[PDB]
Amino acid sequence: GAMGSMERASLIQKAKLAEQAERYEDMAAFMKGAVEKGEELSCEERNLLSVAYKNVVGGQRAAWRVLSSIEQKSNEKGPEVREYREKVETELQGVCDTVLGLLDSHLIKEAGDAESRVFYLKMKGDYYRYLAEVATGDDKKRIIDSARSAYQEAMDISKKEMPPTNPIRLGLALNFSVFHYEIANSPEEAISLAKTTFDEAMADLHTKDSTLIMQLLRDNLTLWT
Amino acid sequence: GAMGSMERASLIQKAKLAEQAERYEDMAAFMKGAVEKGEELSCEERNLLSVAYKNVVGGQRAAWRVLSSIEQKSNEKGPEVREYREKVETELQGVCDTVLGLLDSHLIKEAGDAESRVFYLKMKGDYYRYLAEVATGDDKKRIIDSARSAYQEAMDISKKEMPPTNPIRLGLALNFSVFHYEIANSPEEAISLAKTTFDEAMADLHTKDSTLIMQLLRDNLTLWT
Numbered sequence: 360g361a362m363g364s365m366e367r368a369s370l371i372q373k374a375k376l377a378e379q380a381e382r383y384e385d386m387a388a389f390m391k392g393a394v395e396k397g398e399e400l401s402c403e404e405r406n407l408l409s410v411a412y413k414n415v416v417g418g419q420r421a422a423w424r425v426l427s428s429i430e431q432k433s434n435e436k437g438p439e440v441r442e443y444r445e446k447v448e449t450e451l452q453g454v455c456d457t458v459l460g461l462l463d464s465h466l467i468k469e470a471g472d473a474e475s476r477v478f479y480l481k482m483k484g485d486y487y488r489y490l491a492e493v494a495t496g497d498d499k500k501r502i503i504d505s506a507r508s509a510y511q512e513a514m515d516i517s518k519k520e521m522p523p524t525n526p527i528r529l530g531l532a533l534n535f536s537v538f539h540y541e542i543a544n545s546p547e548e549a550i551s552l553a554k555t556t557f558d559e560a561m562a563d564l565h566t567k568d569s570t571l572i573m574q575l576l577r578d579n580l581t582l583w584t
Numbered sequence: 585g586a587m588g589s590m591e592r593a594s595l596i597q598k599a600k601l602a603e604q605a606e607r608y609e610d611m612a613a614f615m616k617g618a619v620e621k622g623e624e625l626s627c628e629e630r631n632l633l634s635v636a637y638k639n640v641v642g643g644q645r646a647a648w649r650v651l652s653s654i655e656q657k658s659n660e661k662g663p664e665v666r667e668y669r670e671k672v673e674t675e676l677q678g679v680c681d682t683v684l685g686l687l688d689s690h691l692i693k694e695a696g697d698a699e700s701r702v703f704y705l706k707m708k709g710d711y712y713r714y715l716a717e718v719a720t721g722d723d724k725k726r727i728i729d730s731a732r733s734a735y736q737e738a739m740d741i742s743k744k745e746m747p748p749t750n751p752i753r754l755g756l757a758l759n760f761s762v763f764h765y766e767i768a769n770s771p772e773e774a775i776s777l778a779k780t781t782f783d784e785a786m787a788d789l790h791t792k793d794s795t796l797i798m799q800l801l802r803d804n805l806t807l808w809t
């Protein structure tokens with residue numbers, strides 16, 4: 360595709376240039392580029408992937424929210440705001456469906472360092488979650504099953520082979536739980552895991568940046584309870 | 585074109601939605617849309633035009649600068665950074681050439697309230713200036729003539745029919761002078777006008793937001809002298 364002709368290492372250098380210039384569209388395009396090569400990504404590369412995708416989909420989800428909100432106070436008048444809301448909703452689904460293709464097509468295989476098999480399964484759950492935040496109907500149904508399947512296979516792996524301070528295991532559990540509350544409408548399952556996790560981490564805290572996740576991880580229990 | 589089928593007032597409402605959502609690409613697209621209708625813009629509309637275009641071209645010029653800088657420290661190694669720099673340079677020229685089409689094609693006619701005939705001529709000078717910041721050769725030559733022609737016809741009009749507190753006349757002169765220093769390499773002409781203008785404004789200051797322009801207008805003389 361659009362980067363087919365470019366050397367993998369150049370794609371990677373240009374991702375980094377993009378990041379410096381604050382051009383996440385670019386950065387994501389370059390990374391989709393490298394990924395599409397077929398070489399397994401290093402830890403440092405994967406951080407470029409997620410970071411870029413996250414900022415892109417991030418601003419979309421912002422605008423979506425601004426707009427749904429205006430479409431709430433527009434229920435007490437014109438289609439203009441529903442129309443535009445749908446526009447942004449459609450771009451977002453776009454990016455999600457793209458990132459979800461990378462994971463299904465290249466990144467996830469059932470053969471890898473495993474500490475990152477997680478990173479991907481997690482990423483799969485988050486992007487499927489982002490689709491859930493905007494879907495309706497049976498669409499919303501299936502997407503929910505999917506964020507569950509992934510986030511769960513990522514839990515198994517993270518428990519079995521990851522110490523409970525691993526900012527991966529932390530972040531993952533955090534996410535999976537936000538999903539439990541915000542999406543699947545199951546605050547029992549949500550509170551349990553939010554507690555348990557922050558438990559078994561406050562435990563080995565003796566071994567200092569996972570603490571930021573832990574700040575949030577509890578920060579969430581405030582409102583949940 | 586892409587908004588041809590949409591009612592002018594809807595375009596305008598959606599610009600405003602865009603602004604709330606912080607989607608300047610959208611906002612600019614919608615406005616190019618309304619402008620393309622053929623109806624003269626009100627003051628409030630024009631502010632949506634400029635604001636949207638400004639933020640778009642604004643982030644481009646940022647990235648350009650980040651990148652040229654990395655391409656400076658890259659002169660003491662790979663084409664990756666020149667290549668990407670050129671990419672961004674080309675998007676920018678794009679947007680400039682678009683905005684410059686709106687002015688030449690719709691917005692500027694030699695028949696209007698005139699206090700805004702200025703607003704456009706000024707806008708023409710700034711976008712031509714933005715092209716100058718990145719051009720070379722005879723290209724750079726012609727573009728400079730063009731930012732001059734415009735900014736000047738905008739000076740005549742602004743002197744003749746505008747009191748020297750008019751945030752338009754202020755801003756204009758400010759810009760025209762930055763051009764004199766930063767682009768046309770003529771600090772004599774630059775210092776003169778920067779002085780003169782801030783003079784005849786400090787004069788009638790007795791008649792309180794143009795002061796922000798005046799803050800800058802002097803702020804510039806610091807470095808210029």
Ligand SMILES: O=c1[nH]cnc2c1ncn2[C@@H]1O[C@H](COP(=O)(O)O)[C@@H](O)[C@H]1O
Nearest residue numbers: 485488489530531533534537575576579
């Ligand atoms: O850097 C991060 N990594 C993982 N989760 C985060 C991060 N920053 C914030 N969060 C959490 O994610 C929530 C928003 O959901 P998300 O951004 O869709 O994953 C926030 O309310 C936090 O609980």
Ligand SMILES: O=c1[nH]cnc2c1ncn2[C@@H]1O[C@H](COP(=O)(O)O)[C@@H](O)[C@H]1O
Nearest residue numbers: 710713714755756758759762800801804
């Ligand atoms: O809101 C504004 N209107 C007009 N000129 C501005 C504004 N903000 C900053 N400037 C000036 O414009 C310079 C940057 O050039 P410009 O952004 O290409 O017009 C700044 O250094 C200021 O002198």
